[PDB]
């Protein structure tokens, strides 16, 4: 049973422009069916009409994606480096982009009069999920196999701007994935890191 998918921190806030962090790619196990996922976004936690968001998943069979959203796809390799910004200049128009720093591969999608939902700028995150596989129609969505990760993910060089003014992550709110009523990651904030270690 899982019963918080969510691990990493999240600002609340009003007019957040632009919300972007470096993140490591981690070793995984656990099996092909076993997955994480580290990302950033824009709404999504009290603002639950849209969500802007970009990262990459990694599957316990060592195989690894990237995508956006609001759409898959940049090839990932352990150890690499991933730089991840999504941009909201309007509750309907914006950006989200990929760049693996490592191999020097950037990807890019911008977006504009989205009707399938619209955001509110109120929320910034940084985030480790346990997401979820769905299919027919819609009526089965189930979270995948939580994998086990190594070494910890760590946002580094976080960075959160409402207005155009920098926002510290200072108060963020912390929240941890949780599986069988127990914390699976530990993760913490500290100065512009988000450092996420599973357990
Ligand atoms: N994962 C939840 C949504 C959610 C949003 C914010 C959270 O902090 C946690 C969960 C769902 O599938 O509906």
Not at 63 to 79: K, N, P
Not at 84 to 100: P, Q, R
């Amino acid at each position: 049973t899982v019963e918080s998918n969510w691990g990493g921190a999240i600002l609340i806030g009003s007019d957040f422009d632009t919300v972007s962090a470096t993140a490591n790619v981690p070793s995984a196990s656990g099996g092909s069916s076993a997955a994480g996922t580290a990302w950033v976004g824009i709404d999504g936690d009290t603002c639950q009409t849209a969500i802007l968001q970009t990262g990459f998943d990694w599957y316990g069979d060592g195989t690894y994606d990237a995508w956006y959203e609001w759409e898959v796809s940049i090839t990932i390799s352990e150890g690499d480096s991933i730089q991840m910004s999504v941009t909201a200049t309007s509750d309907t128009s914006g950006s989200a982009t990929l760049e693996n720093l490592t191999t020097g591969q950037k990807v890019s999608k911008s977006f504009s009069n989205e009707s399938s939902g619209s955001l509110c700028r109120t929320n910034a995150e940084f985030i480790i999920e346990d997401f979820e596989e769905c299919n027919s129609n819609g009526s089965d969505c189930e979270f995948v196999p939580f994998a086990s990760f190594s070494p910890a993910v760590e946002f580094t060089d976080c960075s959160v701007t409402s207005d155009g003014e920098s926002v510290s992550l200072d108060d963020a709110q912390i929240t941890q994935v949780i599986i069988n009523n127990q914390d699976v990651t530990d993760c913490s904030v500290s100065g512009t890191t988000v450092s996420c270690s599973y357990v």
